[PDB]
Design a protein around this ligand. Structure first.
Ligand SMILES: Nc1ncnc2c1ncn2[C@@H]1O[C@H](COP(=O)(O)OP(=O)(O)O)[C@@H](O)[C@H]1O
Ligand SMILES: [Cl-]
Ligand SMILES: [Cl-]
Ligand SMILES: [K+]
Ligand SMILES: [Mg+2]
Length: 378
């Protein structure tokens, strides 16, 4: 006490605490309200969060991310087998269970997905503690509505290992609805749609709420669609640009590409607020600096297809919920990618002008709700 709410995301995590009737989204040591769900291993240390992602470009093999794509799954799992091909780190099989293998202090080591995630939760726990100036023990941790028992169990174990007493595992969409106070009894049932576009996944959930009780009507989306795909479209655009101006292709330089990706991710965030953004990278390739810029319009074209496609899962969710657009009482934005103006237009146009619940930072909405629920449970 106080107990906190932690959003353990695929790419970013967020922790909040509810005090004096208000939720405080807690900033980390670097002043960031969300922290990368990254962990890195080196000859001398173990890095978590910002410190880990900041060195991902020079240490691709021992920097782990996406642990949430493995958590609660078996090695033989089809999705595990597919994802493994795309990760720079190794995933091994231990008695039918996946484990990430890395080099730490010169020796080989493997960790279960819940162990990597416990490291991320420990970081969030310490972040809350630095702010509260007290020890944090109780917490509510979130999971996608589609997680099964094994995944929920593994996420809870990750918390226990982090030294947290998990009060409860709740679904992200429900946490988001709770953040907006949509769980208050108000007569009859209400249909709420959660549009969650994160950095690596896209989830659309339709909930029916009556008497403070939630009913997941349907879920839709794409487990391999997120802000990270928008960054790639930008990376390819600039690889071509650098090639035209310099007669050089930086494609095979893993570090140069990762550093360009990082500059694009940052330019992207700026484009949600401004109509243009500057990209300036020192010594990108062979000592050549890359100073350029990109417009919001340009950014939207490079991603027009991906953006527009987010509406397919929305139509399917409605169909599976046996509901029509007009029957949705509230539309909630979750995920940092929903801060993109063009995406808000697409969703809004689809719902014929209906206003979107977007006052709470989408990438903080889940942690916000979990923080509210954690206080209640305490
Ligand atoms: N202002 C912004 N505009 C566009 N994208 C953003 C903005 N802020 C954060 N993002 C993106 O949101 C994604 C992940 O954050 P969320 O907070 O969505 O994480 P997670 O993937 O774990 O759910 C990233 O792709 C990140 O670049
Ligand atoms: Cl930190
Ligand atoms: Cl449009
Ligand atoms: K998150
Ligand atoms: Mg998320």
């Amino acid at each position: 006490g106080p107990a906190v709410g932690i959003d353990l995301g695929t790419t970013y995590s967020c922790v909040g605490v509810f005090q004096h009737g208000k939720v405080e989204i807690i900033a980390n040591d670097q002043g960031n309200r969300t922290t990368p769900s990254y962990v890195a291993f080196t000859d001398t240390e173990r890095l978590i969060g910002d410190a880990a992602k900041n060195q991902v470009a020079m240490n691709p093999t021992n920097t782990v991310f996406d642990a949430k794509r493995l958590i609660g799954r078996r090695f033989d799992d089809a999705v595990v087998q597919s994802d493994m091909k795309h990760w720079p780190f190794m995933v091994v099989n231990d008695a039918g269970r996946p484990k990430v293998q890395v080099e730490y202090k010169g020796e080989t080591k493997s960790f279960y997905p819940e162990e990597v995630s416990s490291m991320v939760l420990t970081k969030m726990k310490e972040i809350a503690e630095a702010y509260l100036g007290a020890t944090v023990t109780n917490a509510v941790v979130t999971v996608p509505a589609y997680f099964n028992d094994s995944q929920r169990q593994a996420t809870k174990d990750a918390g226990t290992i982090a030294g947290l007493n998990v009060l409860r595992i709740i679904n992200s969409p429900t946490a988001a609805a709770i953040a907006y106070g949509l769980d208050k009894a108000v007569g009859a049932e209400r249909n709420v749609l959660i549009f969650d576009l994160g950095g690596g996944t896209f989830d659309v959930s339709i909930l029916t709420i009556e008497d403070g009780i939630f009913e997941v009507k349907s879920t839709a989306g794409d487990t391999h669609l997120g802000g990270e795909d928008f960054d790639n479209r930008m990376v390819n655009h600039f690889i071509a640009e650098f090639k035209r101006k310099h007669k050089k292709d930086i494609s095979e330089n893993k570090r140069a590409v990762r550093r360009l990706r990082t500059a694009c991710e940052r330019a992207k965030r700026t484009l949600s607020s401004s109509t243009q953004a500057s990209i300036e990278i020192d010594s990108l390739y062979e000592g050549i600096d890359f100073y350029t810029s990109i417009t919001r319009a340009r950014f939207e074209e490079l991603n027009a297809d991906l953006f527009r496609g987010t509406l397919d899962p929305v139509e399917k969710a409605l169909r599976d919920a046996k509901l029509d657009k007009s029957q949705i009482h509230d539309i909630v934005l979750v995920g940092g990618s929903t801060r993109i103006p063009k995406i808000q237009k697409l969703l809004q146009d689809f719902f014929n002008g209906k206003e979107l619940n977007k006052s709470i930072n989408p990438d903080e909405a889940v942690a916000y709700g979990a923080a509210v629920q954690a206080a209640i449970l305490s």
